[PDB]
Amino acid sequence: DVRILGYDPLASPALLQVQIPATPTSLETAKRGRREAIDIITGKDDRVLVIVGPCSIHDLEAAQEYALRLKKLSDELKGDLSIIMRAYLEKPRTTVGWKGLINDPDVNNTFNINKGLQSARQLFVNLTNIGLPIGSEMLDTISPQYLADLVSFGAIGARTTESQLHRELASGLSFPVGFKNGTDGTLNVAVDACQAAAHSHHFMGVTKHGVAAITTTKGNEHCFVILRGGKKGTNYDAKSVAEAKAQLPAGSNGLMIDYSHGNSNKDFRNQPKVNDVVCEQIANGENAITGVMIESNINEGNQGIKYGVSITDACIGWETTEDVLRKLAAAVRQRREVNK
């Protein structure tokens, strides 16, 4: 163990669940978010599933203010959209950099992971307690034990969609999982991931009491592809969606399109333009698009190391978010008309 500096004690998932209990509203909300998201990706419901909110959460109170606005918009638009807030705790870096709330909640390289996990669960409880479902990237394979009861959607990021460990993980999660296409912009690895996660897996994993055991999973048939561009180009357009559909196996779930990341070409101000392009497909009868993902915050833009502004990727601001989501809802309505 020449490269292990040490091991510091860790509260067990079960312990944290008792110390920071979910409310009845919190649990009911998480269940509802899962039902609603399942109905949309499997084509039972004709609304669009929207995963919308910050790139990352670094500020609990700001996240709560944002949740309150989004919960109100979600009440306004619920005939047409099912909204789940991005409450992303874990951030994959290109090389190194802030990994998120769990890993370093004080954002100052002290890495108080126990406090991160307490802040993470108190956050998840606080958001779901106002009746808003939340979603997060499942990067760490141990973290979900601490938080899964509160979560209605999980994302596997572009850099881990190929990882057999993350496909294993997804195969045992109690909620829908969106696998992002690879960083090269092609979808094959995400389709492979969905198939893989749909099978039963055996692997070593951590229990609620914090010990390693052999886990057997059931297989997760609520996995879907998220289109998020990449080096081969953006993939939110009708030609990219036609190629995507051409590649889907029998049994596939609906596609989600991420407006941000590679689909925004390094410019958050592109997300409303992606929205216009996606809305046009939907409004003209595209039924394979069942989800969108949007990086949105109280205030727009980003910053390196200001209230309600991202410290990771740049987001559209609140007012733009309203306009984007109202436009999406209307495209949903128009699609109902086409389908009559």
Residues lying near a copy of itself in the complex (CB under 8 A) are found at: 1-10, 12, 92-96, 99, 103-104, 111, 113-114, 139-143, 148-149, 158-160, 162-166, 171-174, 182-184, 186, 189, 192, 195-196, 199-200, 202-207, 210-220, 231
Collect all residues with Cβ–Cβ distance below 8 Å to 340 and sequence separation of at least 6.
Answer: none
Distance CA 81, CA 326 (A): 9
Collect all residues with Cβ–Cβ distance below 8 Å to 126 and sequence separation of at least 6.
Answer: 60, 64, 67
Size of the site for Mn ion (CB under 5 A): 2
**Based on CB atoms, which residue is closest to a copy of itself, 143 or 234?**
143
Sign of the alpha-carbon torsion through 327, 330, 332, 338: negative
Q: Can you read off the two tokens belonging to residue 53?
A: 């909110």
Judged by beta carbon distances under 5 to 8 A according to partner kind, the member of a copy of itself, Mn ion, none in contact with residue 178 is: none
Distance CA 172, CA 120 (A): 21
107: left (phi over 0), alpha (psi -120 to 50) or beta: left
Considering the rule CB under 5 A, would residue 313 count as an interface residue with Mn ion? yes
- Give the nearest distance from C-beta 221 to a copy of itself in angstroms: 10
Judged by beta carbon distances under 5 to 8 A according to partner kind, the member of a copy of itself, Mn ion, none in contact with residue 55 is: Mn ion
Judged by beta carbon distances under 5 to 8 A according to partner kind, the member of Mn ion, a copy of itself, none in contact with residue 99 is: a copy of itself
Give the chain's length: 340
Considering the rule CB under 5 A, would residue 55 count as an interface residue with Mn ion? yes
Contact 145, 207 (CB under 8 A): yes
Instruction: Pick the stretch among 19-27, 157-165, 210-218, 309-317 that binds Mn ion (CB under 5 A).
Output: 309-317
Considering the rule CB under 5 A, would residue 298 count as an interface residue with Mn ion? no
**Based on CB atoms, which residue is closest to Mn ion, 283 or 314?**
314
Q: Can you read off the two tokens belonging to residue 312?
A: 């990771």
- Give the nearest distance from C-beta 78 to a copy of itself in angstroms: 25
Distance CA 247, CA 250 (A): 10
- Give the nearest distance from C-beta 29 to a copy of itself in angstroms: 14
Judged by beta carbon distances under 5 to 8 A according to partner kind, the member of a copy of itself, Mn ion, none in contact with residue 313 is: Mn ion
